[PDB]
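Blackboard transcription, Thursday session:
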Amino acid sequence: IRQKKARTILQHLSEAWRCWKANIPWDVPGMPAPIKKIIERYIKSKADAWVSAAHYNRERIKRGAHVEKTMVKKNLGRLTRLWIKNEQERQRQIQKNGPEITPEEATTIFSVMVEWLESRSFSPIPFPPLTYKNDTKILVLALEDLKDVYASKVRLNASEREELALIEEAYDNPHDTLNRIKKYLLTQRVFKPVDITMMENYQNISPVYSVDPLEKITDAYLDQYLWYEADQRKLFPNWIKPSDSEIPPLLVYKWTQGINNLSEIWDVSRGQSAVLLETTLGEMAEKIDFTLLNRLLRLIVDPNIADYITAKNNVVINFKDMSHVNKYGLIRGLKFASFIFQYYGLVIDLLLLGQERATDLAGPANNPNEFMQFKSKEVEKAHPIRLYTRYLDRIYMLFHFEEDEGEELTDEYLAENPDPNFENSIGYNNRKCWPKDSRMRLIRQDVNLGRAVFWEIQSRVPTSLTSIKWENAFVSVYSKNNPNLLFSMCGFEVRILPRQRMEEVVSNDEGVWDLVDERTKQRTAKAYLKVSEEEIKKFDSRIRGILMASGSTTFTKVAAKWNTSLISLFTYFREAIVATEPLLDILVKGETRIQNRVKLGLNSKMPTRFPPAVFYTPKELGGLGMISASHILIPASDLSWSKQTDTGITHFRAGMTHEDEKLIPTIFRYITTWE
Amino acid sequence: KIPAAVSNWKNPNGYTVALERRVENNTINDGFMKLSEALENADKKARQ
Amino acid sequence: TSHRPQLEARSGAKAAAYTPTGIEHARLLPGHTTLKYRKSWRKGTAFGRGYINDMTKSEYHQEFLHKHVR
Amino acid sequence: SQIPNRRFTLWWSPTINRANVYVGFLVQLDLTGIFLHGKIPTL
Amino acid sequence: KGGVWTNVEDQILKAAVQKYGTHQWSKVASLLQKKTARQSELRWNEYLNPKLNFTEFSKEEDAQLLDLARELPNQWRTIADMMARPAQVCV
Amino acid sequence: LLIHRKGLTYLHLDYNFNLKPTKTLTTKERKKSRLGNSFHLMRELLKM
Amino acid sequence: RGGISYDQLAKLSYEKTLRNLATQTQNSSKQDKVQKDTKTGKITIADDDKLVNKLAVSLQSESKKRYEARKRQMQNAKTLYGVESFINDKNKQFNEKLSRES
Amino acid sequence: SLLTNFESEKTGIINTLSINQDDVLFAGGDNGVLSFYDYKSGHKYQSLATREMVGSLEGERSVLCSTFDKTGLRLITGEADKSIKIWKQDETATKESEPGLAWNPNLSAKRF
Amino acid sequence: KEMLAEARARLLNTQGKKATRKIRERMLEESKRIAELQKRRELKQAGIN
RNA sequence: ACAAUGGAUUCUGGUAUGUUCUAGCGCUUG
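(Written on the board underneath:)
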C-alpha cells in the first residue's frame, strides 16, 4: 500500500461523513468489513464532537454570552440536521412497531366522536358544488390572504414571482381557477415535496414549511371554505379558542371575569376548594395518525375532501440534501392544517369532558351557550368541572370541589400512589415570578389534592394521542390555606385574589384588573397581571435578531425595526408591563443596544456626542424617530424581601441618563389601557 | 481490495461516472392491519 | 486543485538546523520560577377507571430537541 | 454599499463634532479651519 | 408558463446528473434554459431515475396494492415505498 | 532612522511627532507603512 | 488463482533471466580475479568487458521491450471502448478502472 | 538486545501495553481481544474479549489505553465505548484448575 | 440545438479559472521563450553572440 | 424627613496581485 492507495481510502471517510449528515445510510458494495468497521467508528467519534458542540453552543446562545455571527448560523444549521434526524428516527420507529394507538383505543375514540356529532345532529360538510353562492367571495379571501405577503417585501425570486403570476391569473379568471381547484380536490392525491426551513429565535428553533404555490392556492381555497362551513354549521364549540370573535387579551379578560362570575367560587366557609389546571397537550400535532385521521374526517367532511387532506399530509419533506416521507406526523405548514388541529382538539376535548359534561358546556344545539354561560345554575352546580377552554395545545380547566368530593378524590390517589415521606411538595411547580407569600403555598392537603386532580385528568387521555406530563402541568388550588388563584394565559401571568380574602383593601395602579360580579355590579376580586417570563425572553430574542440581521444596515432602518418591535410588545402587553420588573430591565438593555448600533455606525460610542435629540427627534426633522421606553425610573425595592412579599415601590432605579436632562415621554402613556 | 469512491456531492476532476455508481426490504406489521379493520368495524357499526 | 490534504506533517528536523532569532515572547517571560517537590362524575368520561452509548438516541438529546424546537 | 448614513451624520454634525469631548485628539482638516475631535470618517 | 419535458431536456438532465450527482440541482438546472431546480429534481425523482420501475404490475402486486389501500387510506407516498413503485404509478 | 531604514521615506515625521504621509499611497505602500502599536506608542510618549 | 506475492514474483523473474542467459550461451556456443589493495582497503575485480557489454545491452533491450509492450497496450485500450460517456483520457481510464472492480 | 519475541499471532493493531511487577504483560488490541503474556517467556496465557455496552457499534470494542496500579493487582483500561474497565486478577485460582493456555511453541511460526 | 451545444460545451470543460489561466500563462511563457531563442539564432547568423 | 449619577477609541475595507523594463562592449574562433 502506497501514497496512491492511502489517498483513495480517505475519500470513503469524507463521503461517509456526508452520508451521516444526510442521514443516508452509507453502504459501499465490496468494501472490506474491517475497513468499514474502522470508518464507522471514527464517524461516531466525530458525531459525538459534532453533536456535543451543537449542544454546548445552544446553551451559550440562550445565555446570550458572546456568540459569533457566523456561529449562530452554523448552530442553526447543526440543529436542523439533528431535528430532522430525530424526526426520521421517529418515523421509522412508528413504521416498525406499528401505530401507537391500539385498535381498541381508536374504536373508542371514533365511537365518542360519532356520539358527539349525533348529539349535536351535525350535518356533514359537502364538497363545494359547481353552483356555490359564496364561491367567488371565498376564492377572493384566499387569494388576498396569499397576496398579503407580497406588499411587504421588495425583491422576489423565481418561486415568489411564480406565486405572483398564479394569483394574478386567478384574479382574471375566477371561474377557470375554481374549476381547477374543484378538479384537484377530486383527483389529485400525490403532491410535490415540501421544504423545511428553520427560524432562529435564540431560545428555540422553529420550523417553517414551504408548499408549492400551485398547491398553495387550492389549499387556501379549501381552508377558507372549511372554516366558513364549520362556522355556519357551528362545528367547534365555545371552549375551542381563539374564537375569531376576540383578541387574546380579551380572552384573558373574559376568562378572568368568567371565574369571578361563577357562583360561590371564593367561599371557603366549609372546606370546599377551587382548582385550576394548566398543561400543554404535548406533541399534539406530531402524534396524529392519518388512518385514524381520515376515518375521523369522514364523519364531517364529504370523503373526497377528506381523502385530499389525508393525502396532502403525506408528502416528501426536503432539507438541503436529506429527504424523508412524512408517514405519520401532521404538517402544520399547510393552510388547512389549522382546521385539522382544532378538530383533533375537539376529539381530545370530548375525552377529558365526557359526553355528558361537554353538552353542559356547549349547551343544546339549537341554542348554544356563550363562552362562559350555562343555561341554569343547577346545570352549573353538578359535575365539578366548572370552566374549560383550550387555546391551542394549552388546556385550562377550573374545578370546584366540595370538601367531601375533594377528600374522596385525594384519598384514592393516595391509595394508588402513597407517600410515606410526604414528598409531594418537592416535585410540585408553581409560578416563581410572584412573591413567596403571593404564590401558592405548599400545604400538604392542597398539594395532594392538586396532584390527584392532575392524575384524574391524565388518565382520561391515552398516551398514544398526546403526552400529558406533570412537568408541563401547572396546577393551582384555591382554599382556606391559599387565597391566590394563579394561572398563565396567552402571555399573561395572572393572580386572581378575591376581595374578602384581601385582609385589607388598598387602591392599585392600573396593572390590576378589577373583576366585577354581574348581578351585584360590585368589584369582588382583583386580578393582578404580569408578563410571562417566556414572553420576556421572546422579546429579548427579537432585539437580538434585529441587531444580528443588521450588519451595516442604515440607521433609519434599525430605528424603524426598533419601533415596530417595541410597539408590538407594548400594544399587546398594555397592562402587564408595570408590575414586571425583569421586563423593564430588558427594555433598558434593549433600547441602549439599538442606540449603540448607531454609535457603532459612527466610530464613537461617546455619550456627549449623542444627545437624546439625535435619537428621538422625529424623521420629519432629520432625527431617527426612535420611540422611547427606557427613560423611566425603574422601581427597586429590597430584593431580599421582595421574594417574600409584595413590598411596594419604595425606591427608584434610574433607567437612562444623559449629561443634559430631557424628560422624554414614554408610549405607555400614549396607549390606552386594556381594562 | 478497496472500491473506488464515487461521490454524490463532490466531483473534483469532473468525471462523468454512470448513474448507478453515483446513487428497504420489510413489510408492515399487523398493527396497521388491525387498526384499519377496527376503524371500519366501528364505522359499519356506526352506519347501522 | 490548490486545496489539498496532507501527505505528511511539517517535521521538526527542518527547524532544528535553522539559526535561531531570540525574539522575546510574552508567554516565555519568567513565571512560576520555583519547583515544588513532593515529600359519579368520573363515570361520564370515555376512559374511566438506562444509559445508551448513542448521543442521538440519548434521553437528554430527546429532552433537548423537545424544548429547543417547540 | 449605498449609505444614506452620510446625510444623517452631516445633518447632526455640529453635535457630533462637539468640543465638549471627553478624550479626542485635536486635528485640523487639511485646507480648512474645522477642528476634528478624534476620527469620525463618515463625517 | 410551466413547461413540459422534451426528450432533449431529459437527455441533458441525464448527463448532468451523471456529471454532478443528485445533490447539486441548481447547477443542473443552469444547463436547462427554462426549468427550475425544484422542477429538475422532481423530474429526476419521479420519471428519469433508473432505480424506478415503469413495469406493469403482476397479479400478486394488484392484490397487494388493494390490500395496502385499505390499510393506509389513502397514503400514497407511504404505499409507494411499500410497493417500491413511483407514487403516481400507484395511484 | 527607523522609518527610513524600513524604506518609508514618504512618511514625514515632523518635529511635533505627528506622522503624516507626503503623498497618496498605493495599496502595497499602505501595507508596508502600517506601523505597530509599539512604534506609535513610543512616538506618543515623545509627543507628550 | 489470485495474485502472486513479491517473493514468488522475484523468483520467477530470477528463473526467466537464467533461461535467457542459458540460451544466450547456447546461441554463442552454436556459432563456434580478486585483488584487495591493503592500503586503500578497496577490492578490485577483473572481468570480461564483453560480458559487461552484454549485461548492459540486455537490460536496455528488456527496458525497450516492456516500453513497447506497454505502448501498444496504451494505443489499443484507448481505441477499444467508447460506449460509456467520458470527457478526457483520465475519465476513460477511471471508468474502466471501475469495470475491473466489478 | 532483543530479549524475546512474544506469541502474538492474529491480534492485529496493538493499541497499548503495560507491564506488571509480576511479569504480566498486558496487550490491548483494537479488536477488544485483550491478551495477557508472561513477560519472561512470551506465553499468551489468557485472551479475553469485552462487552461494549447496551448499544454501540462493533468497532467500539477496542482497548485504547491501559496501565496497572502501583500494587499491580488492578488493570485500568480505557476503551472506545466511553468506558473505563477495571480488570481484577482473581483470587483462589491455582496452577491446577486454571492453567491458562498450553505452552506450545511451533516451527511454523518463525517467531521463537 | 443551441442549448444542447451549450450543454455539450459545459459538460466537457472541467478545469476552472486557476487552471485555465495557468494553461494560458504557460503557452505565453513557451512562446516568449521560442521567440527569444529564434532571435538569438538570427543574431548568430549575423555573427553577434 | 432624601443626600446613592456606568459609559468614552484605535487598527484590520475591489484593484488586489504578477511579469519585463541592459547605458557603459572581457582578449580567441565565428
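Lecturer's comment: Residues 603-609, 651, 654, 657 of chain A lie near RNA strand J (CB under 10 Å from a C1').
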